[PDB]
């Protein structure tokens, strides 16, 4: 149905954001070091 897809979108927004944030934190650590 659509409820599973809506929950997937809500989780996936945070999933893409978290992957990007982890990449950004790794980039900041790499630039510092």
């Amino acid at each position: 149905n659509m409820k599973d897809f809506e929950n997937q979108i809500t989780e996936l927004k945070k999933e893409n954001f978290n992957l990007k944030l982890r990449i950004y934190f790794l980039e900041e650590r790499m630039q510092q070091e």
Binding site: E6, N18, L19, Y24
Partner: protein, 778 residues
């Protein structure tokens, strides 16, 4: 690998296969995460998988031999990998995609010597892992004396001596060889590396006599291997539990030697033939063959530590077919794990795992609780108490997490001043079932983790710290916040270098002393903090994750700071600290904006005492100030009662439902995640819109203050015009508010999120802006 290692590896494999569509790289990541056996233990069709692999293997015999060598080396996930490989070779499309992608990526781009080397490597590993911990050094003469080796030493012309006399000479020879002394006719000779002593028999003997002698001799060669293996494995660097295994092997060798002495006495009595001798030896011969097989399985890859304990459990399971083998496996597992399992019980019961052999399941690494307090990562949580899934037994593999958790909990209680030693800890001995050891470890964890939680709550006063944080960072104590605002009104508003941080600290201290926050026992723990960047700029940068041109002021940088002391420093991190500091800075900015609006309206009251017909320009300014103040007050009330308050209530309730460190962390994280989700801290455009609205309000307040100052003396862009500039600032602030409302409504429509609907209702209570929002939606 990393915390996002699943997604990282999934996307790396998707790019390696050059397949970002189809199912998708995140689809493969979700397939792996959702469809995932908790461990590589499920059984597979060994014969069927071997045939399937052999259909496309460069050498099926090589595949089988590789599996055997991997078993010797204690390689993990080999049979499951074989099943997956057979399935993938059946999957020609997946195999073809992987092969083409790999092509594209490539185009783009003696026994004594071995024993000495093994002892040296074990010593090297023990030195690298011991941090200078000294280990016993055996006199090298023991390993350097081949005459001291216990294996088989590693004749009359048989055509001339009588068959009976030749048989008697060979019997003495075999008694010597099986007792470690090369016989006259049959002598077991040196083994090249890990092997048994090779028996070479005189070729002129009687056919059947020599055949039966060799048939008995299989046990002799196996025992020559076992004695050499016991001497080699007796090195201390191989492991203390390895030392226990070597001692058990030596005791078994001693029992076999007693049997061989009885055999020599019977040879003195003359009560056998070669075949009868083999028949009598058959039981001990089978035991020695099994022991040699087990020793090969262990030492071929040097299974030591919990890898050797998992091998022992697997051996007990493989010996379940033969009851004597299963019972001996359980008993010897108990005997061997007594050192290792006692260390594991010490690790789980006392929070300290001691193994100079480095055979402890729960490990410890250098960590700083002060760093845990100041940095987002928990150094004490991760490095100071690590979990190594290489010294965890197979019977303890599932409970490795719980055992290491009990050890870390005991260590945390010790850092909390409670000497960690589990009173329900049990001596751990490996048997066919570690289920009882699992239950004991669970009780030890429920003791140690509870002790750490109790120390953090009572001894460390985590609840008191939470109350102080609510009073300072969230401004739960309004008197202290008002006093700080009053004292730092002219100090924080000064620039970064124009506002003395010492003056800021003094004003905050005066606010705490002269406010109701002095009632908090930890009210003095709060201090003034300066952000490295603007709060809105930081919010935008963090959302966009993957100061000479921006005005800097002490009011912008003003915030609360808190220091964490272990084990509370091991609990409080800098990610939550950064979120709380951002919230505190935002709250301070909102309070300053509300105070400015109230001050603007108060000076706007001069028209009430003045003639009402000489305030035409100020009427619009006063109306705009009142409207902005009312909208800000309604928005602030709604936000305070719905966003931050739900986070605090969730934190309190879930920590009340938290029993362990993990439960408390989950409670606090749920509260923090609810706060972050409800605060709309993901849109830099929203942060910019809020900053624009606050700037419009500030410009209107500045214009009104300039007009009031000019009127009192008579008795930039905002100050240039009285009412036209006020109208433009009101229009800009209303546009920013409408954009924020539209973004909130979109979020409510997409994410069931009622916060935007509540905000719209709060701003459109009287319908002054309800119609405007509805019209702007179209």
């Amino acid at each position: 690998m990393s915390e996002f290692r699943i997604h990282h590896d999934v996307n790396e494999l998707l790019s390696l296969l050059r397949v970002h569509g189809g199912d998708g790289a995140e689809v493969y990541i979700d397939l792996l995460q959702k469809n995932r056996t908790p461990y590589v233990t499920t059984t597979v069709s060994a014969h069927s998988a071997k045939v399937k692999i052999a259909e496309f293997s460069r050498t099926p015999e090589d595949f089988l031999k590789k599996y055997d060598e991997l078993k010797s080396k204690n390689t993990r996930n080999l049979d499951p990998l074989v099943y997956l490989l057979s399935k993938l070779m059946e999957d020609r499309e997946t195999l073809q995609y992987l092969q083409q992608n790999a092509k594209e990526r490539a185009e783009l781009a003696t026994w004594q010597q071995s024993l000495e080397l093994t002892r040296k490597m074990l010593r090297d590993k023990q030195s690298k892992k011991n941090s200078g911990q000294r280990l016993p050094v055996l006199p090298a003469w023991v390993y350097e004396r081949p005459a001291l080796l216990g294996d088989f030493l590693p004749a009359v012309p048989i055509g001339s001596l009588p068959l009976a006399s030749q048989e008697a000479a060979v019997v003495e020879d075999l008694l010597y060889v099986l007792v470690g002394v090369d016989g006259r006719y049959i002598s077991a000779q040196p083994l090249t590396g890990r092997q048994g002593r090779t028996f070479l028999v005189d070729p002129n003997l009687d056919l059947s006599i020599r055949e039966l002698v060799s048939r008995i001799l299989p046990v002799a060669a196996s025992y020559s291997t076992v004695t050499r293996f016991i001497e080699e494995k007796s090195s201390f660097e191989y492991g203390q539990v390895n030392h226990a295994l070597a001692a058990a092997m030596r005791t078994l060798v001693k029992e076999y030697l007693v049997l061989v002495t009885q055999l020599e006495q019977l040879q003195r009595q003359g009560l056998l033939s070669l075949q009868k001798l083999w028949f009598y030896i058959q039981p001990a011969m089978r035991s020695l063959d099994i022991l040699a097989s087990l020793a090969t399985s262990v030492d071929k890859g040097e299974c030591i530590g919990g890898a050797t304990l998992s091998l022992l459990h697997d051996r007990s399971f493989s010996y379940t077919g033969d009851s004597q083998a299963q019972e001996l496996c359980l008993h010897l597992t108990k005997a061997a794990s007594t050192p290792y399992f006692e260390i594991l019980e010490k690790w789980i019961y006392r929070g300290i795992i001691d193994d100079p052999y480095s055979e402890f399941m729960v490990e410890e690494h250098e960590l700083r609780k002060e760093k845990i307090q100041e940095d987002y990562n928990d150094k004490y949580w991760d490095q100071r108490y690590t979990v190594v899934q290489r010294q965890i037994p197979s019977f303890l593999q599932k409970m490795a997490g719980k055992v290491l958790s009990t050890g870390k909990y005991l260590n945390v209680v010790r850092e909390c001043g409670h000497d960690v030693t589990c009173p329900v800890a049990k001596e751990v001995v490996y048997t066919l079932k570690e289920r009882a050891y699992v239950e004991q470890i669970e009780k030890a964890f429920s003791y140690a983790s509870k002790v750490l939680l109790d120390f953090l709550m009572g001894e460390k006063e985590l609840l008191a710290h939470l109350r102080s944080i609510k009073r300072y960072f969230l401004m739960d104590q309004g008197d202290f916040f008002v006093h700080f605002m009053d004292l730092t009104e002219e100090e924080l508003k000064k620039p970064v270098d124009d506002i003395t941080p010492t003056r800021l600290e003094a004003l905050l201290e005066l606010a705490l002393r002269m406010s109701t926050a002095n009632t908090d026992p930890f009210k003095d723990d709060l201090k003034i903090d300066l952000m490295p960047h603007d709060l809105i700029t930081q919010l935008l940068r963090v959302l966009a994750i993957e100061p000479t041109e921006l005005t800097l002021s002490g009011l912008e940088a003003f915030s609360f700071d808190y220091v964490v002391t272990w084990p509370l420093s091991l609990i409080i991190n800098r990610k939550a600290l950064t979120r709380y500091q951002m919230l505190f800075r935002h709250m301070f900015y909102c309070k300053h904006v509300e105070r400015q609006l109230c001050s603007v309206w108060i000076s706007n009251k001069a028209a009430k005492r003045f003639s009402l017909h000489s305030a035409k320009w100020f009427a619009g300014a006063f109306t705009l100030r009142q409207r902005m103040l009312n909208f800000v007050q309604n928005i602030q009330s709604y936000m305070m009662f719905e966003v931050m308050e739900p986070t605090w209530h969730v934190l309190e309730q879930n920590l009340r439902s938290a029993s362990n460190i993990d439960d408390v962390l989950g409670h606090h994280a749920s509260f923090l995640d609810n706060c972050l989700k409800d605060c709309m801290l993901t849109n830099p455009e929203l942060l910019r819109v809020f900053s624009k609205l606050m700037s419009v309000c500030v410009m209107f307040t500045n214009c009104l203050q300039r007009f009031t100052q000019s009127m009192k003396l008579d008795s930039p862009q905002l100050a240039s015009s009285f009412e036209a500039t006020i109208t433009k600032f009101d229009k800009n602030f209303s546009a920013h508010l409408l954009d924020l409302l539209a973004r909130l409504s979109i979020y409510s429509t997409s994410d069931c999120e009622h916060g935007m609907a509540s905000v719209i209702s709060r701003l459109d209570f009287n319908g002054f802006y309800t119609e405007r929002l509805e019209r702007l939606s179209a």
